[PDB]
From a paper:
The response regulator VbrR from Vibrio parahaemolyticus, a member of the OmpR/PhoB family, regulates virulence and antibiotic resistance genes. VbrR is a member of the OmpR/PhoB family and contains an N-terminal receiver domain (RD) and a C-terminal DNA-binding domain (DBD), connected by a flexible linker, and can directly bind with the promoter region of exsC to mediate its downregulation. The VbrK/VbrR TCS is activated by host-derived nitrite during infection, which leads to the downregulation of Type-3 secretion system-1 (T3SS1) via repression of its positive regulator exsC for maximal virulence. In the cell or solution, VbrR proteins exist mainly as inhibitory dimers formed through the DBD, and phosphorylation of RDs allows the formation of RD dimers, which in turn changes the conformation of the DBD from an inhibitory state to an active state.
We purified and crystallized the RD protein in the presence of BeF 3 – and solved the corresponding structure to 2.80 Å. The asymmetric unit contains fourteen RD molecules, comprising four dimers (AB, CD, EF, and GH) and six monomers (I to N). However, the BeF 3 – molecule only binds to molecules A, B and E, among which molecules A and B form a homodimer. The AB homodimer superimposes very well with the RD domain structure within the VbrR-DNA complex (RMSD is 0.92 Å), and the dimer interface is composed of α4-β5-α5 from both protomers, both of which represent an active dimer conformation. The homodimer interaction surface is maintained mainly by four intermolecular salt bridges formed between residues Asp91, Asp96, Arg110 and Arg112 from each protomer, and all these residues are highly conserved among members of the OmpR/PhoB subfamily. The other three dimers (CD, EF, and GH) in the asymmetric unit also adopt an active conformation similar to that of AB, even without BeF 3 – binding, probably due to crystal packing or high protein concentration. The BeF 3 – molecule is noncovalently bound to the active site Asp51, where it occupies four coordination sites with residues Thr78, Lys100, Gln53, and Mg 2+. Mg 2+ forms five coordinates with BeF 3 –, residues Glu9, Asp10, and Gln53. Interestingly, six molecules (I to N) exist as monomers in the asymmetric unit. In particular, the residue Tyr97 adopting an inward-facing conformation in the active dimer changes to an outward-facing conformation in all the monomers.
Residue numbers in the entry: 2 to 117
The structure:
Amino acid sequence: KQTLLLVEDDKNLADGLLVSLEQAGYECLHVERIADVEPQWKKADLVILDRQLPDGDSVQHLPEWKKIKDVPVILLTALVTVKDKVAGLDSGANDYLTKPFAEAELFARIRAQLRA
Ligand code: BEF
Ligand SMILES: [Mg+2]
């Protein structure tokens, strides 16, 4: 069994999301602030990361998050500009996928981050 962590302030988006991954045979964590990622970063084998929480930007903490544990990070945010893409990808994100998004593709990019 594999463990992912969902960092998302959008509840209802996280609502229908946290069920498909469970149907994919996972155990997940949900987080809606930046004051809740550090307690759970050491727990998941992959982080699905939303940028603008009510705390601020989550990419600013991403490097200091990444060196606690080299965890694959997938940035799922409504920041679609290429300037935002190069920001997260270089900050330590193994992938970057914008909103709106495909569940079958997000799962494929998760199935691609966990084969090593
Ligand atoms: F509000 Be998130 F970054 F999509
Ligand atoms: Mg958000």
